[PDB]
């Protein structure tokens, strides 16, 4: 009754087996008969037939992707016996052709990343229930492939299709006879030079059109890239877009566009996001008669339109930018200019809804920051990666021309207005630096190569910063009053400042941490801190989370030094502590007891520990999570239930533990989750996990243990069938060691 | 006849067994009877008796250090049976007392890092042949320990002792009745406040005296440090040093010295190295009547004498520095001043033999570099770690107050005069920066946070640099003429410049490498290079070694891109190639053949490789070393001898290989060294390593393989005894896997 090899979960009242990554040479027949969704993805299966999926009714979905992993042979009508399948995922299977005789029940089919160069009536036209069809990434780049032949009006018979992606195939022409029902159509990187009037003419329901990468701009492309003759523009008919009144999204990126016809937008009152990236638009950004046509546009991406070899003094913004009323975010990146002036952004200053200006990668030497205060709604000022001074490698399921991640880390932005100066040249903060800025909750100073001693006078122009990123500088903390002018400070990231800390002869002062009443999260990671000056303790009444990882506690806690024994005790509010990567061989008993007793979460993981005193857990009544992972530990206590009543989760994975003590799990009612994976365990005696009282443990991880496959594991196997509420994951990965006959075989298979 | 557990080598015609780190619970009786030196260090041995070392004549030396590893019990006169022992190393054994009844044959004894607080006539006085005696590091710091009692005139009876180290013990007084034969005597950190006239009075042969750490300067000490009352100076008698005419070395460091008596040096015409570190000497460096007493002093270390809280404009050097004629290196570090002026170093400019000035850690903002040209002999200018702008944790066997490593990397210094600007603020190189400098062969620019585009005009003031360290900056290579003004350039280190390289939208230009006729070693490591602009190939006719490690060849060599296929082919002189850490799953065949055919050494190690085409080795007739270590490789060819005649060394360690092919080792006469360690091998068939022709293989590493201990390994065990010229190391670490009975046991032990 324990599901194998498939792990089974419950989602939306429904039933889904996860068989992915299971090294399956063939499709299991042991699948739960109730299963709605079957994921075979990333396996070794080389064959599909009519016997494979039998006995299975409610399956609406099959993921066959990535088989076999590092030549999938499918029989005609192998999938026909199943009338309930909507979604079918065949991606990355090295398929020569579309599989013949697919069920007509298919709403959604994914052929992405295959060898199919021929789209035929036989493979498609008989599926009338097709909603979304993905053919993308079959013929592209320098791959050896045939130009894609698309049989006349093959999609003509699909009256229900709202999504079609042919992107990254060799087409050269938009296929004739496209169904009216089309909503989203992806034509990107199809090598199409010409868009006629009659191509999209009959689609009135299109909400999205992707023409990107046709007549590409190939200079400095990090992919094989072939431009149109002379590197000319795509030729788009004056009337090509006239009958799309419903279009929300238009991706024109990398089309080599020098000038844009404003009459393309005549019929599109609803245009929302316009992607103009990777063209030559500097002239159009200077004048831009096409802007007056976009009153509803929310997002506009003009990024990377730079003229080759040019490094102008100022950016030139058309006054017509005042005509985009609903604009929210504006991306200008790789425009490459020297100096941003107050009067250059004038057209943007009256835009009511524009919260985001992306200026990244412009090589800007200087800005007057009083212009950002003359805007209305700005929540995000993204200046990252500039010169500002003081005073398959491509995911077919992702956007090709930019990253889809947030500009600012959501944790930071949630506090308020955001200013990202990261990856710049400001190595020193002058008294006047931040003057005339808005009220800044979130400030990113990361990677500014800042060597200064912070005296507490630096941020006084913007005292209300909640979240401060100082990461990856070389910071000299010689002053006890540092950063104290920020009274409302909550999150502080000091990570990767190790420059001065690692020099012993200089002075280091951390005392500033006590002065913060609201301080909550503090990152002190990877600072290589082995020594401090006159003050050996970190003390805060507010602080909650402290990440001390990547420092030397092996030195601080050295047996011959009593000075740092209390180092964390002064943090009385602290529920979370990260001691990882400190090279700890052991923790002196006196130093462990001096840990804050408020801790609910403690990570000592990824150290060298050969010893752990479990009796010391008596002093931590609030501790729900203990992370011991990635150590040398040989030793487990049998008395643990006498040591802690509070422990929900215990992670022991990747240790040297060879033996489970008799009465280990007994009488501890708290422990839900136990990670024993990747240990030295040969067997489990009957008396290890037996608990006379009530056992709340719902998860046990045994994978990676050298199990003796003899009759001695009968006690444990029996224990497994006796409790089915304990989930052991990766049951194909719990693998018998000895005897040599049973080596490689799962423990769940035995006489 | 295969030595076990001890590995045996030959040094100085002699015979030494290495038993270290062998997890020995007891002292082996299997030791080769001829053995001169026996190293038991870092083992589990808990006992020593009279039966341990029997049958062994010529042993002159025994290393018992670090036993047991993580309570050594020695019987009275356990070592007496051996009349040939000179050296005895007992270090770090947690010894309560000196072992009683030690042989009188001992010239050298090391008790370092033990619990011995009592030095008695019974343990020592009967050994008259003692030459060097190390008692150091028994009672120190915050360790729980007893003040050291030294029985009256216990060393009085040792007439042959030239070396005594009591350092880091609690003494408070220099022991009375010291033998005349003393040459080197280490009293450091013994808590001695007073040096009387009669302490050292009777030692005329002393070449070395270490008084360091008595009355320590404890501000900002990274160890528990207790000063004398008021933090006063050590009190040294006017006449204390009068009878040492032979003293070469004097370590006074960390004695809290405000002023120095010049009459201490009255009788020392031979003084060579004087260590003054960690005192308050700023006044003495300003006047210093003691300098006129040191005509022969070669090294003078004044480092870390800074006045607390002081940041003066200029350093003040006494005119009396002109009076040290034989001075070679001068260390002034942590003097902490702002500005170095031409006229401040005037007293030093006429010193004929002074090649080295160590200015590190002074927080210097500016220097006029034309003063270094007014010296005579300077080979080393060490400016590292300053503010200059544009335009147990302690090793008992090491120096406690500084690092003993070279200032400049020897490879760099060997080229000529050296200038180390590393760890500074110069973020831009102006045209006039290096003007008025000497002729610089070796230049360290590391860690200057330099973002500039090097145009080839930058170094023209010092064109003759052979070795250039640009490591750990953020370098923008946008120019093809970069660095080309250096015609004689040999070694170039570009490591850790990854800042701009990882941005795809910008341009990257490596073309400058071809312009160098003498370029030999090039470090391009950890630059995260996945993309380049207009030039996809590295080309040099001279270049020999290229380290490409820490980049992305997984991206560059992606199957869908032909652009970078030839990337290294243009280097026609290259004998050494490092492809490590490139995340390579596989190398496309066309890309491997495009590797330089001149390669004698190739490292692909520490990648993800699941595949290697051995047939491609046919194209590398010069290749003596192939490094495949740290990969996923499952597959070994049986045909290798047909593939390469040139391969001396093959490193396969840490791979997934489960099987040795029949006829693997056969007919390849070239292979000396084979590393199979840490693989999946269960057994070795008789036909794997059998070679009908002449076999030159002298080294085979099998440790870490899950060996079946059944009778099936008889074929291999037999093969081992049949060839004794093949050295298998770590024979305690070649460990039987199955059956469970033999698990943990070395394969060399079987029925
Ligand atoms: C030209 O410009 C257009 C318009 O911006 C771009 O069109 C977008 O293309 C991307 C890439 O395909 C789309 O992003 C993906 O959307 C998939 C569909 O999600 C929809 O439905 C789900 C629920 O069913 C909703 O949650 C979601 O909001 C959408 O409504 C997602 O399945 C994808 O995510 C999956 O893959 C990614 C990457 O592996 C993972 O991160 C996810 O966890 C998940 O597994 C992905 O989000 C996007 O939907 C398109 N926009 C529109 C409006 O349709 C073109 O890409 C662009 N041209 C190019 C090539 O640059
Ligand atoms: C220096 O140190 C600080 C302090 O730790 C780090 O900042 C924290 O970083 C961790 C990431 O490592 C962040 O934790 C992550 O938070 C996400 C929270 O997302 C929000 O929105 C979701 C809904 O989408 C809500 O559910 C949630 O409540 C939040 O409001 C979580 O999504 C993440 O959890 C997921 O991953 C974790 C394991 O990582 C699993 O346990 C979860 O089940 C789930 O799979 C994770 O919690 C944390 O938010 C950061 N906090 C702060 C203050 O920023 C810095 O990143 C670190 N910097 C450096 C340089 O290392
Ligand atoms: C005050 O100042 C004095 C004078 O400078 C310092 O005295 C030096 O102390 C150090 C530390 O003990 C000595 O360094 C060590 O010397 C040992 C002896 O080497 C001699 O003999 C060998 C061959 O037998 C020669 O090769 C060598 O040149 C010497 O003639 C070495 O054995 C040590 O090296 C071993 O340990 C180190 C560290 O583990 C390893 O790096 C080595 O590989 C090796 O295993 C070490 O080199 C030094 O000899 C002393 N100088 C003199 C002139 O005797 C004091 O240390 C200083 N006071 C303090 C505490 O700061
Ligand atoms: C960027 O890349 C460059 C190029 O590789 C690196 O520079 C090389 O660094 C390696 C060290 O990793 C250096 O190689 C080492 O050289 C030592 C040579 O010492 C000299 O003197 C000895 C006598 O004392 C002579 O025998 C010798 O001929 C030399 O004249 C060797 O001692 C080292 O070998 C020892 O270690 C190696 C393994 O490391 C063993 O194989 C040996 O048997 C022995 O145990 C080693 O050879 C090399 O010298 C450097 N060359 C240059 C040009 O500097 C940079 O370090 C790297 N930088 C960064 C930032 O990573
Ligand atoms: C301040 O600015 C710096 C630099 O721009 C920001 O660092 C960047 O943060 C992003 C988001 O976390 C990182 O990208 C992510 O990396 C992880 C790990 O590989 C990956 O899982 C994610 O999918 C995403 O790719 C990025 O690594 C990092 N960049 C650098 C230079 O390290 C930082 O986030 C900013 N801080 C705040 C609070 O905004
Ligand atoms: C240029 O200046 C930099 C910075 O001072 C030098 O880097 C430093 O080099 C030394 C010598 O190699 C490194 O010390 C060594 O580290 C290794 C690895 O841990 C260790 O095995 C050695 O015993 C020694 O401790 C040191 O790591 C490194 N410092 C930094 C900041 O990384 C560099 O050597 C200089 N280049 C030249 C050519 O002089
Ligand atoms: C030789 C170093 O010992 C102390 C020290 N530590 C620092 C430090 N972390 N930062 C500094 C910044 C500017 C000037 C001096 C210092 C300094 N200093 C120098 C001094 C001004 C005496 O504190
Ligand atoms: C948007 C980036 O695309 C090209 C580029 N790459 C670089 C570069 N690696 N470095 C630069 C330094 C100063 C000014 C401009 C650039 C630059 N630029 C800008 C430009 C002047 C057009 O080359
Ligand atoms: C601005 O956005 C708000 C929603 O936050 C919306 O109510 C308002 O109508 C928008 N104004 C314009 C000009 O689009
Ligand atoms: C910190 O710096 C401020 C301003 O430079 C100064 O007033 C104060 O003395 C410093 N605090 C110290 C040294 O503890
Ligand atoms: C301790 O943390 C809690 C939870 O964040 C917070 O409410 C409280 O203010 C903190 N205590 C102090 C003294 O700030
Ligand atoms: C564990 O900690 C306790 C303190 O409660 C101490 O008595 C005991 O010695 C420690 N155990 C070990 C093995 O150090
Ligand atoms: C300087 O050093 C050389 C050896 O290189 C030596 O011959 C000469 O006598 C020394 N001069 C002085 C003043 O010590
Ligand atoms: C490199 O820089 C020099 C000086 O700035 C300039 O003369 C030359 O044009 C540049 N070379 C290029 C861009 O290839
Ligand atoms: C190739 O390397 C050798 C050995 O260092 C050197 O002698 C020769 O000059 C190099 N060849 C060229 C063309 O510089
Ligand atoms: C190995 O390389 C040779 C070229 O000599 C090629 O013919 C063969 O296909 C390659 N082997 C594999 C398994 O790719």
Curated annotation (Swiss-Prot), chains A, B:
Effect of residue 427 to L: In IMD98; gain-of-function variant resulting in increased NF-kappa-B activation measured in a reporter assay
Protein keywords: Disease variant, Disulfide bond, Endosome, Glycoprotein, Immunity, Inflammatory response, Innate immunity, Leucine-rich repeat, Membrane, Receptor, Repeat, Signal, Transmembrane, Transmembrane helix, Ubl conjugation
Glycan attachment sites: 12, 50, 58, 73, 118, 205, 243, 251, 316, 320, 353, 374, 444, 479, 515, 523, 573, 613, 685
LRR repeats: 84-105, 106-126, 129-151, 160-181, 182-202, 205-226, 246-267, 270-292, 296-318, 326-347, 353-374, 377-391, 415-436, 439-460, 464-484, 488-510, 518-539, 542-563, 573-594, 598-618, 622-643, 646-667, 670-691
Broad class of the protein's primary localization: membrane
Tissue distribution of the protein: Expressed in myeloid dendritic cells, monocytes, and monocyte-derived dendritic cells.
Membrane topology annotation: Single-pass type I membrane protein
Paired cysteines (S-S): 6-19, 139-145, 215-228, 218-225, 412-442, 709-736
Post-translation changes: Ubiquitinated by RNF216; leading to degradation by the proteasome. Proteolytic processing occurs in monocytes and monocyte-derived macrophages by both furin-like proprotein convertase and cathepsins. The cleavage is necessary for dimer formation and subsequent activation.
Localization annotation: Endosome membrane
Consequence when changing residue 505 to V: In IMD98; increased NF-kappa-B activation measured in a reporter assay; results in increased TLR8 protein degradation
GO CC, any one term: endolysosome membrane
GO biological process: canonical NF-kappaB signal transduction; cellular response to mechanical stimulus; defense response to virus; immunoglobulin mediated immune response; inflammatory response; innate immune response; negative regulation of interleukin-12 production; positive regulation of canonical NF-kappaB signal transduction
Domain of life: Eukaryota
Domain LRRCT: 705-751
Positions in the Extracellular compartment: 1-751
The keyword Transcription regulation appears for this protein: no
Consequence the record notes for mutating residue 390 to L: In IMD98; gain-of-function variant resulting in increased NF-kappa-B activation measured in a reporter assay
A molecular function GO annotation: single-stranded RNA binding
Regulation of protein activity: Activated by RNAs having enough uridines.
Assembly description: Homodimer. Interacts with MYD88 via their respective TIR domains. Interacts with UNC93B1. Interacts with BTK. Interacts with SMPDL3B.
Protein task: Endosomal receptor that plays a key role in innate and adaptive immunity. Controls host immune response against pathogens through recognition of RNA degradation products specific to microorganisms that are initially processed by RNASET2. Recognizes GU-rich single-stranded RNA (GU-rich RNA) derived from SARS-CoV-2, SARS-CoV-1 and HIV-1 viruses. Upon binding to agonists, undergoes dimerization that brings TIR domains from the two molecules into direct contact, leading to the recruitment of TIR-containing downstream adapter MYD88 through homotypic interaction.
Disease named in the record: Immunodeficiency 98 with autoinflammation, X-linked: An X-linked disorder characterized by onset of recurrent infections associated with lymphoproliferation and autoinflammation in the first decade of life. Mostly males are affected; carrier females may have mild symptoms. Features include mouth ulcers, fever, poor early growth, hepatosplenomegaly, lymphadenopathy, polyarthritis, and non-infectious enteritis.
Family designation: Belongs to the Toll-like receptor family.
Protein name, as recorded: Toll-like receptor 8
Origin species: Homo sapiens
Higher taxonomy: Eukaryota, Metazoa, Chordata, Craniata, Vertebrata
Gene, per the UniProt record: TLR8
